[PDB]
Design an enzyme around this catalytic site. Structure first.
Site, mmCIF file in Angstrom:
data_model
loop_
_atom_site.group_PDB
_atom_site.id
_atom_site.type_symbol
_atom_site.label_atom_id
_atom_site.label_comp_id
_atom_site.label_asym_id
_atom_site.label_seq_id
_atom_site.Cartn_x
_atom_site.Cartn_y
_atom_site.Cartn_z
ATOM 1 N N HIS A 25 -5.911 7.431 -3.123
ATOM 2 C CA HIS A 25 -6.979 6.600 -2.515
ATOM 3 C C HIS A 25 -6.447 5.849 -1.311
ATOM 4 C CE1 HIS A 25 -5.281 3.214 -4.606
ATOM 5 N NE2 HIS A 25 -5.993 2.437 -3.803
ATOM 6 N N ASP A 26 -5.130 5.704 -1.166
ATOM 7 C CA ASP A 26 -4.558 4.986 0.005
ATOM 8 C C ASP A 26 -3.554 5.875 0.770
ATOM 9 O OD1 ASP A 26 -5.795 2.350 0.263
ATOM 10 O OD2 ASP A 26 -4.517 1.607 -1.351
ATOM 11 N N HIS B 156 0.855 -1.219 0.000
ATOM 12 C CA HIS B 156 0.000 0.000 0.000
ATOM 13 C C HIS B 156 0.877 1.250 0.000
ATOM 14 C CE1 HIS B 156 -3.255 -2.794 1.291
ATOM 15 N NE2 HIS B 156 -3.896 -2.064 0.375
ATOM 16 N N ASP C 175 -8.408 -0.732 -8.202
ATOM 17 C CA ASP C 175 -7.722 -1.079 -6.938
ATOM 18 C C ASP C 175 -7.233 -2.513 -6.937
ATOM 19 O OD1 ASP C 175 -6.643 -0.427 -4.511
ATOM 20 O OD2 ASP C 175 -8.545 -0.719 -3.428
ATOM 21 N N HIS D 23 1.662 1.509 -5.739
ATOM 22 C CA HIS D 23 0.237 1.075 -5.833
ATOM 23 C C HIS D 23 -0.631 2.255 -6.300
ATOM 24 C CE1 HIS D 23 -3.593 -0.788 -4.879
ATOM 25 N NE2 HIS D 23 -3.832 0.150 -3.947
ATOM 26 N N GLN E 162 -6.099 -17.594 -3.031
ATOM 27 C CA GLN E 162 -6.195 -16.787 -4.283
ATOM 28 C C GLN E 162 -7.380 -17.256 -5.151
ATOM 29 O OE1 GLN E 162 -4.259 -13.885 -5.465
ATOM 30 N NE2 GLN E 162 -4.518 -13.967 -3.253
HETATM 31 C C1 LIG Z 1 -6.825 -13.723 -0.906
HETATM 32 C C2 LIG Z 1 -6.936 -12.243 -1.051
HETATM 33 N N1 LIG Z 1 -6.136 -11.545 -1.943
HETATM 34 C C3 LIG Z 1 -6.327 -10.220 -1.999
HETATM 35 N N2 LIG Z 1 -5.550 -9.470 -2.935
HETATM 36 C C4 LIG Z 1 -4.945 -10.299 -4.006
HETATM 37 C C5 LIG Z 1 -4.879 -9.365 -5.212
HETATM 38 C C6 LIG Z 1 -5.762 -8.198 -4.982
HETATM 39 C C7 LIG Z 1 -6.123 -8.262 -3.547
HETATM 40 C C8 LIG Z 1 -7.224 -9.457 -1.129
HETATM 41 C C9 LIG Z 1 -7.449 -8.022 -1.076
HETATM 42 C C10 LIG Z 1 -8.362 -7.495 -0.161
HETATM 43 C C11 LIG Z 1 -9.083 -8.390 0.737
HETATM 44 O O1 LIG Z 1 -10.068 -8.057 1.700
HETATM 45 C C12 LIG Z 1 -10.860 -9.200 2.173
HETATM 46 C C13 LIG Z 1 -12.043 -9.614 1.349
HETATM 47 C C14 LIG Z 1 -12.304 -11.090 1.238
HETATM 48 C C15 LIG Z 1 -13.316 -10.181 1.854
HETATM 49 C C16 LIG Z 1 -8.883 -9.783 0.686
HETATM 50 C C17 LIG Z 1 -7.954 -10.318 -0.231
HETATM 51 N N3 LIG Z 1 -7.799 -11.683 -0.231
HETATM 52 MG MG LIG Z 2 -7.392 1.122 0.466
HETATM 53 ZN ZN LIG Z 3 -5.612 0.568 -2.869
#
Ligand SMILES: Cc1nc(N2CCCC2)c2ccc(OCC3CC3)cc2n1
Ligand SMILES: [Mg+2]
Ligand SMILES: [Zn+2]
Length: 313
Positions: free
Chosen positions: A106-107, A68, A217, A72, A269
Site C-alpha cells: 500500500h506504500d 514509510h 494503516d 510498516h 497527538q
Molecule cells: C499528529 C498526527 N499523527 C499522525 N500519525 C500518528 C500515528 C498514526 C499517524 C498522522 C498521520 C497522518 C496524517 O495526515 C494528516 C491528517 C490530519 C489530517 C496526520 C497525522 N497527524
Molecule cells: Mg500511504
Molecule cells: Zn501506510
C-alpha cells in the site's frame, strides 16, 4: 505442498493478537507474512515460489525512510491479518487473498513525503495523478511488480476473478489516502445508525474495506504504549524532514512538520487521536465487533499522551 512456515512459540501465540509487534529482525518479516497468508487464506492460495519472489521484489521497492518502509508494510498486513482472523466468515476467498497483498503493497516506493509536499514541489507524480497522488503511484508499482516474469501470484485465478482481486487491491490502496477517510467514515456512521448498512451491497463492502485499510494503516496507535511512543519518533522524523523541505520552497510548514515546535507534539497527538484514530476504531468496532481490542488499545494510548502533557511522563 506440505511445507508449512512455523514460528517460535512466543510469535506463534502473539501474532494472533492485534497489538503484536513484528520485531527488529528484518529477515523474519517475509516468513511472518507467508505464515499469515497460509493461515488467513490457505497453503494453496499462492504458489510459494512465486509468492516468495513477489514478497522480495516488494521489499526491494520500499525505500530506507524512517517510517514509510518495509517494516510498516508488514506491520499493516499483520493488523489486516488480525482483523480477518477475528471475522472468519464475513470475507470471501478473493478478499482474504487481495487484502493481505494490498496491505503489503500500500506504500510501495514511498519517499517519506505527503501528497501536499509533492503538489507544492510540483513533482511529476502530481501532474500524472491530481488526487491521491502517492496512492495511485503505490497501486501502479503493485501492478508493475505483478507483471514481472515469475511474479504473477494470481495466475491461477480465472480472468474475472483476476479483475475482481486487482479491483479490491486498487480500492484498498486508494482508501489509505487519509484525505478520503473522513467522508468514508461519516457515510459508514450514517448507514450503520439508520440501519441501511448492507454487506451484500458491493458499494457498502468497498466502504467497510476502506475503513479496515485506514484502521490497519494507523495501527501504530493500537500497540502497547512503548511501541506506540517509539513509532511516533519515526513518524515525526519524516514530518520534520518534510517541514524542512517546505522551508526550502519558502513555505512555513504546519507546526506538526516544524522541528522547532517539538513541544507541541503531545497536544498534536491528542487532536489526531480525537479527530482521526478514535472515530476510526469506534465505527470499525460498530461494524465488526471483534475488532474492539484496537479501539481499547487506542483509548489506552490517548490516556498515555494525556499523561505526557500533565508532565507525569
Ligand atoms: C499528529 C498526527 N499523527 C499522525 N500519525 C500518528 C500515528 C498514526 C499517524 C498522522 C498521520 C497522518 C496524517 O495526515 C494528516 C491528517 C490530519 C489530517 C496526520 C497525522 N497527524
Ligand atoms: Mg500511504
Ligand atoms: Zn501506510
Amino acid at each position: 505442498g506440505l511445507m508449512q512456515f512455523t514460528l517460535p512459540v512466543r510469535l506463534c501465540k502473539e501474532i494472533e493478537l492485534f497489538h503484536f509487534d513484528i520485531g527488529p529482525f528484518e529477515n523474519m518479516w517475509p516468513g511472518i507474512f507467508v505464515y499469515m497468508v497460509h493461515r488467513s487464506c490457505g497453503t494453496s492460495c499462492f504458489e510459494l515460489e512465486k509468492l516468495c519472489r513477489f514478497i522480495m521484489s516488494v521489499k526491494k521497492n520500499y525505500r530506507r525512510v524512517p517510517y514509510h518502509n518495509w517494516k510498516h508494510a508488514v506491520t499493516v498486513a499483520h493488523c489486516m491479518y488480525a482483523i480477518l482472523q477475528n471475522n472468519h466468515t464475513l470475507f470471501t476467498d478473493l478478499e482474504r487473498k487481495g487484502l493481505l497483498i494490498a496491505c503489503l503493497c500500500h506504500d510501495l516506493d514511498h519517499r517519506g513525503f505527503s501528497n501536499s509536499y509533492l503538489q507544492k514541489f510540483d513533482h511529476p507524480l502530481a501532474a500524472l495523478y491530481s488526487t491521491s497522488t502517492m496512492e495511485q503511484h503505490h497501486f501502479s508499482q503493485t501492478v508493475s511488480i505483478l507483471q514481472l516474469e515469475g511474479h504473477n501470484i494470481f495466475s491461477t485465478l480465472s480472468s474475472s476473478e483476476y479483475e475482481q482481486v486487482l479491483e479490491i487491491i486498487r480500492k484498498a490502496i486508494i482508501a489509505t489516502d487519509l484525505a478520503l477517510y473522513f467522508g468514508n467514515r461519516k457515510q459508514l456512521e450514517e448507514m450503520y445508525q439508520t440501519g441501511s448498512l448492507n454487506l451484500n451491497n458491493q458499494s457498502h463492502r468497498d466502504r467497510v474495506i476502506g475503513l479496515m485499510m485506514t484502521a490497519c494503516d494507523l495501527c501504530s496507535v493500537t500497540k502497547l504504549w512503548p511501541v506506540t511512543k517509539l513509532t511516533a519518533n519515526d513518524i515525526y522524523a519524516e514530518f520534520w524532514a518534510e517541514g524542512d523541505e517546505m522551508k526550502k520552497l519558502g513555505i512555513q510548514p504546519i507546526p506538526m512538520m516544524d522541528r522547532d515546535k517539538k513541544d507541541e507534539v503531545p497536544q498534536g497527538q491528542l487532536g489526531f487521536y480525537n479527530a482521526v484514530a478514535i472515530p476510526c476504531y469506534t465505527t470499525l468496532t460498530q461494524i465488526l465487533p471483534p475488532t474492539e481490542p484496537l479501539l481499547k488499545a487506542c483509548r489506552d494510548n490517548l490516556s498515555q499522551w494525556e499523561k505526557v502533557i500533565r508532565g507525569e511522563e
